[PDB]
Amino acid sequence: IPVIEPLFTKVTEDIPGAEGPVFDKNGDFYIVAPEVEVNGKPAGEILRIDLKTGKKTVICKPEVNGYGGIPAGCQCDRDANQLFVADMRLGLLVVQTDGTFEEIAKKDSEGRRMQGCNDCAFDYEGNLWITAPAGEVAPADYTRSMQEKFGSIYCFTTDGQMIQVDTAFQFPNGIAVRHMNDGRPYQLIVAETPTKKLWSYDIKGPAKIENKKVWGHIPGTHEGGADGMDFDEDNNLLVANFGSSHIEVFGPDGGQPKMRIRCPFEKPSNLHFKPQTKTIFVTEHENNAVWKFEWQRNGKKQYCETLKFGIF
Template sequence: MRLGILTVKPNGEFTQVARVDEGGRTMQGCNDCSLDYTGNLWVTAPAGDIAPNEYLRSFEEGFGSIYCLTTQGKVVHLDTGLRFPNGIAVVHDVNGLPVKLIVAETPTRILWAYDIQGPGSVANKTKWAKLPDCEQEGGPDGMDFDDVGNLLVAHWGAGHIEVFGPDGGEPIKRIKCPFDKPSNVHFEPNSNIVYVTEHTNHALWKFQWENKGMPQYCDKN
């Protein structure tokens, strides 16, 4: 969240992708990302302007943004005004084309949906789902689709993985975790094994889900 978007090699060397977007605005600090099947990278940015600017985050004030790093190397600023946009996922149609972007807004517990009109272009922001209330401060964090279109969402602070059907709305299932702050979920390729990161103890867990994960960009290409 201090350097925006990075590319990291297997040996740990990294490169900062951009300091400004295609409009010349300073990049905001990023948090989560998802590749669609055509190779565009969709990114949430809950922090303020990247270093050396002062570190700020949009948990209270809604200045969080979303970006798209296109296959042409353009960093497109898509939207702003979000309170700590966090997890992000892409819905594809039966032909493998990206059609919808799901973005988690943690403090409000809302999952927003945008229609994808093309690389670096979205429209029609709507509320796709809202996570159940919880006693602690928290909300949606990382997320991943299974291969029948269910979205598994880490509910940070509530100790659950919330499962939403392909059309959003209310959770169709809730998976109880043995800890309060699941932060990210990700399927093992071609498997029903789900890995879960735990925020408090910096731990990694796994469980078996009833379906395999949706194929990733790397599985398709």
């Protein structure tokens, strides 16, 4: 498999478990530090990064009734400049730029307790597809599906329903939605980290997924596997292969990667394109840092980049 070696430039450092890279509607850059701890207890943070200086600013340190969060993945909303954050302890949160947040759900549409979330992806219809590799949210004792298959998938809809769309995953992780050229969502990709698999479903509608299939195979027998992911403008899927020193590039049809991107570190965690550019910001857990490198083309527009009132 051809491997390219682009130049990685340092963005910022010392962010415990640097994850969920995201750009808001103003182009501000955010990162989550899920692994920050205070006396052995979770105390995860959401930070704003000044891209010019590398200076970090913690805007939110989520806690619900004393239970600190483990914010791990982000998506920026379209109709309002707010971040939807997958939290390993708190579930789904919505964080404002002023640093205030709200817990979206303690239970799903079926009255079942909410599970801790890791990453999420907004489709062009505004529905949020979330991976929930953790067990029940706080106050429940923290558990994660790295060994046992109790990881679930959710779809937080436009009409506010938190629907569990699938279950029994061994650590569902990165997630992305594939759209038709006209903008219609039709395929969901779910990373199952330890099994070195990328799963796909046909999106038949809001919170409606069918035909579960092993879509792609992640290289290596190392500990880790597919973590964060994102599509480029040509619908190639870039996946951070945690523990492999690479980011895998899958073609529109999946299967085996058609190219690999060597990172000057072994643990790429997540990635995100800077709107309107070929720049990919990459988080990694070896040095707990953020880097950026130039990909071959622009990234696929995120939900926050689309227009509610666009004519075209």
